[model samples]
Target: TIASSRLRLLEYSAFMEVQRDPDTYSKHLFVHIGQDPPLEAVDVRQIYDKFPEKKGGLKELYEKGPPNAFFLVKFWADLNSTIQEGPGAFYGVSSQYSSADSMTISVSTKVCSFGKQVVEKVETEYARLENGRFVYRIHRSPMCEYMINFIHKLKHLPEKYMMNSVLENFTILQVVTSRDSQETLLVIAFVFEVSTSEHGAQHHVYKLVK
Candidate 1:
């Protein structure tokens, strides 16, 4: 608890490994992607106050591994409509978001197929593309995957209409190419599958952001 030099060394390397392949993240950074009403649609007043810092260190984050999340979704005409006053536990990112608390979250896909990646694009890239940045990061866990699955069971909707917070604020991504051979492995996310069991809040689109 008294070694400044040692602390500097560890800290330096922590950033070092991450730069090589950034992965460790917290749930705090997450936010809705392609949302229409944006923040107002979310009923959680606690969310508006302030997002708190996440507790933990790089070691555990490393040990815990990366969500390195990547997948496609034929999303609804923005998931917010499906998000209205629904069950929180089965819907949101985690069980901590309770229904009794009057919280509601959009449904999600049941599982995430995992593999690997290529060049390391930074967070701002995600923010800029599809118009989001320094924003909601995907925090992957088996629980997150299952939450996506539960939505599948509950909604019984078409595969395309199914959505998941497993990777939010995603779509029209540019993260793929090839094995440096012929075809690249780019994932095109959020090609919306339009319909209407959910058209509750298109008015928000007209609402002023002033």
Candidate 2:
């Protein structure tokens, strides 16, 4: 009975953190709450950029309530990364077979810091989906200064390389790849490129090297 009370108190404390900055806190809870707001990368960034104040522990983001509440967004792509094709395309790709074009890269992340400032832990990997599509997932702490540095460096490698010669070389804190995939493939490489410009803002770019 005593343990139950403590658990309830802890849960309530967590909820209060959400109330302080729903935009930031929501991301952490959406997976557990069953009501995740679907949002675009641009929309998410817009809200994050405006929030200015450094997130407090679990507290963070926004001024005019959570934007997720006002706008309805939908998933533009699926697990197969298919957004276009004739009718039946949604189910057309067999669970066992993924098309080359359907390849996707997904990322998982956490929060880290350097001294008093928030920072990121960076890593990248090359992968293949069960359906046979290529995937290059990046794992990093939340987007922070440290994370930006590595990403900037990664974007400058050459697109192609010579046999047994280093293609493009960049530096980072870490790289992770699956044991099975690494042993099976001949070799894989990476190049980093930031976006040209979008509405006057430069966006960081990352892609896989085959």
Candidate 3:
């Protein structure tokens, strides 16, 4: 009874994954699993504010049907416009019940990609054959790929392509050149086909349908 009586409040943390255009390198749409606005945005608030501290506590709770509980907060923005009030859900009571609530909120930013692609930095070096001089270049891996054939397919099916996220991102393009005795190299590039909209906010870009 004592453990149950010690009611406690909780705060949670979550993340948002965004895809950007590889060509112009612009912010794309926010990822979501739902079909609604706020629901369609990224969220982790459903994970409950607290869990059983004792190892067996959670297992014990599960023994009895499911625990009914939930809470959520969502923030979304368009390309040019600053964030205006969007759709969201809130039920039950917030865990914050103190004056320091304002200070506890924070945000972090970084570049990220979806699927096999990732954000990273790299450096390379090579020697020149013209003279005694050498040459080198710096580049990053986890780069994006533009699917040429797939895009060509998309152009033919604009109505179908616009709804599919995969078509929006680049498709892998491969080049192959071979001979009886010749060296071969792989060339890759990240390509995207998208249109831009007028600035809606200071730092956000509004995404449009192709």
Candidate 4:
């Protein structure tokens, strides 16, 4: 056997393959001004860039009319390290997931902060087949800041913990208090890596799109 010289550039040749992929992006700011608009990223900065008051909350972006019949927004990424994408929508589905075997997950989450006390109660929804592909309805259902922050930081669930549970459904029935000092605050989501037998393993990124 004859040996031939081969050049192997490990570090230099390799690219951040996940960089172009929106799902792997660690942080995103999701905003739904109203209706079933295409869930791709929008030029939302123009709406609030000039405003001195940037709650980054709904009260500002929303109105009582057709253009702003309703408002929902969420912002979070990985805690320590994550690719922070400034775009509003990246993942193809709104934030929500649960790999629970139980049909109903009465899981209530007390999330981080607000003017921010929200009791985040979570549930799930199934991905439906559309055309030749699959799609999850944008979960514009309300959630608290805490819930958004908590789930955004996750990459995977515990293997042992998942042994009994299977993630599926998604939604929220929430609660809060006037504790009147501050306030509409509490939350949260399911973002995890799934290990499969066919392929080695892959992380799933979900957000809203058409």
Candidate 5:
């Protein structure tokens, strides 16, 4: 089967539903998932050779923490593989990403928050791909309320946040407020987070490319 068409109608339908409302995404809000790094930081090789070009340069990634970046790559790659390994299972791969191979090569997330004000702004003007894996360009944006709420979500949790593959290249970088509203705005950043794995090399950032 051709990899390009793997997502097909199912993905398109899902995209449409999300696009229609664009506000319901609470846990996994994303936009403009690309296959390679943006033009700005792609050529920097110190971090690129070590990781996959699909994920982009870890060195220039918004979040810091080399150890975690290594883990993030392996986690996403492994997740892609896990779904492919068991397509028929309930949580098994459905209609998203490249099923042909277990390893995936993309990372995407836009600003997310339960707060209405922030969501309204992001929904109005943000870039995205029709149907692609998560790959995003790095640029600083204003902090919004969603970020603070997320931190609050973590703060009162049953336990401390665990560092793992799913959480890598992900964080709330900043929080700001409007001069008038005084409502907090959350600035979230996606980056690689890691822990030890089977080969030790299990944790490595994706190879970045232009």
Candidate 6:
């Protein structure tokens, strides 16, 4: 199971894949957008460039950026064939795999004054399949910020700790992963690139396109 194939098992709805089950072609593909109508056109390489170079995340661009973004936008040739070869779809947490196909874009309006009238736009969209190919346009803004907020919200609780024991619903997936394989792999990798302002009035918006 490679990154993209593992991702196919998670990002898209289990039902969506369920609908495509037995039909391996449809069951094993996905895409994401920076926002609705799409974010500004960015060179596919930008995903790897900005994250590690400008902001710095992964020490090396394995294939490029995160596995999902890298696979769809950059190394499609290598991954597409791999997924096709497997001709399989993964499901369930017990299966030891989960992934999400989402891209977030955000821009900040920094004002010297108390309220600089910050306006952030978040978009929600998915990629189209033409002959079973996946595509994605990722933005660096809102997605990371949203994760930052998500991280803040989590506080210090262990991810494995079950909160609602009665329901037996543990905090399964909280943050997004840099890898396309499993959602929980997100961890604290994003913290390296974000900063919290003293005023603490940062604003961000996100949409899941899965």
Model 5, span 1-210: residue lDDT tens = 101221111120001111213353211112222222222222334433333323223343523322212211222221111111121111111122322212222222333222111232222112235444331222333334454344334334443234242243343212212223432221222233332333322222232233
Model 6 whole-model lDDT (C-alpha atoms): 0.25
Candidate 1, position 71, lDDT? 25
RMSD in Å for all candidates: 20.6, 22.8, 22.3, 21.5, 20.4, 19.1
TM-score of each prediction = 0.18, 0.20, 0.18, 0.20, 0.21, 0.18
Give, for candidate 4, the lowest lDDT window spanning 10 residues.
Answer: 6-15
Residues 1-210, model 3: lDDT tens digits: 000111111221111122233332222222111101122221222211222123222223233312221111221212121222122211111111111111121111111223233222222223222333222222122222332233234435545336245433322221111122221111111223332334321111111111
**Stretches of model 5 off by over 4 angstroms after superposition:** 1-109, 112-142, 161-189, 192-207
lDDT top scorer: 4
Q: In order, how many clashes per candidate?
A: 16, 4, 12, 27, 29, 4
lDDT: worst 10-residue window of model 3: 1-10
lDDT of each: 0.23, 0.22, 0.22, 0.27, 0.26, 0.25
**In candidate 6, what are the lDDT values of residues 1-210, reduced to their tens digit?**
123322332221111122334543433221111212232233334333223332112324333334333222211100111232232233211111233433221211121111121222323324434434433333222223432233324333343122112112111122223333433222111101111233311212121111
Q: How would you encode candidate 1's per-residue C-alpha lDDT over 61-105 as one tens digit per residue?
A: 223322122222233433332223323322232111111111112
**Can you list the residue pairs that collide in candidate 2?**
98-131, 154-192, 155-192, 155-193
Query: Which 10-residue window of candidate 6 scores lowest in summed lDDT?
Result: 72-81
Comparison by TM-score, 2 against 6, better one: 2
Candidate 3 residues lying further than 4 Å off, grouped into runs, are 1-146, 160-164, 167-193, 197-210
Q: Candidate 3 has what TM-score? A: 0.18
lDDT for 76 (candidate 5): 20
| Comparison by lDDT, 1 against 5, better one | 5
